[PDB]
Design a binder for this molecule. Sequence first.
Ligand SMILES: [Cl-]
Ligand SMILES: [Cl-]
Lengths: 135, 135
Amino acid sequence: MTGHIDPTKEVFAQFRANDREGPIHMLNLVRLRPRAAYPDGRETTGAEAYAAYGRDSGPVSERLGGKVVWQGQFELMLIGPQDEHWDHVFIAEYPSVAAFVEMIRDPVYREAVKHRQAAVEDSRLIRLKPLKPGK
Amino acid sequence: MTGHIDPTKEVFAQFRANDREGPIHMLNLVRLRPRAAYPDGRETTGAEAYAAYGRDSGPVSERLGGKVVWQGQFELMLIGPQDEHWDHVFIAEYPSVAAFVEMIRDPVYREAVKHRQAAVEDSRLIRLKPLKPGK
Ligand SMILES: [Cl-]
Ligand SMILES: [Cl-]
């Protein structure tokens, strides 16, 4: 897959534009590459690289209010194409758009994400407003 | 569009094949038609048809242990293609694979789902095993 790894500048501007007060839930669908694509040639698995991203970004996220509020192990694409499969599926909550922006501006995060860039073959990051589960 | 609306028979077999004990979380991503595509030709919005699906399927789901455990309003595809957007995004929990199979076999559900078939332009239905949110 030549898939989607990073957000575009235009769409991130849209993210920041919609700054309504309230938590944001970030649904992540991540397909990891078998071999990590670092610029230096280093040879490691996508999983190992994604782990490093996690290890190094965790504290920044935690400090600014991020928390993983749901996580699941992928078992089956019951409706959808079979070429779609995800290795990590989770929802991260942040208490504000501003918290998320501060995370992605953090110098420590900006280094950690270099690992994500090397790790991810394809992904989705869907921004949602949480609802009371009654439609 | 030619999206994915229903599960294929082969993939549903795989779903039933994996009958490990424990709840299942079903992540639904649903894109609705502007105009519902029933056999009748009747004019209703996709939203109206999906409403009817929910209305008539709710009791069956409830009776067999189904519950919506998380639900969100789509705000932005931050990472991914901009043509991907979803009108309904939620996670339904069932206590077993069998509970879910009994739902989709229920004759009341089998009529309700006709509304889903009319409503949905494209969708994903991802089966997950819930994890304790620590990687
Ligand atoms: Cl996130
Ligand atoms: Cl479901």
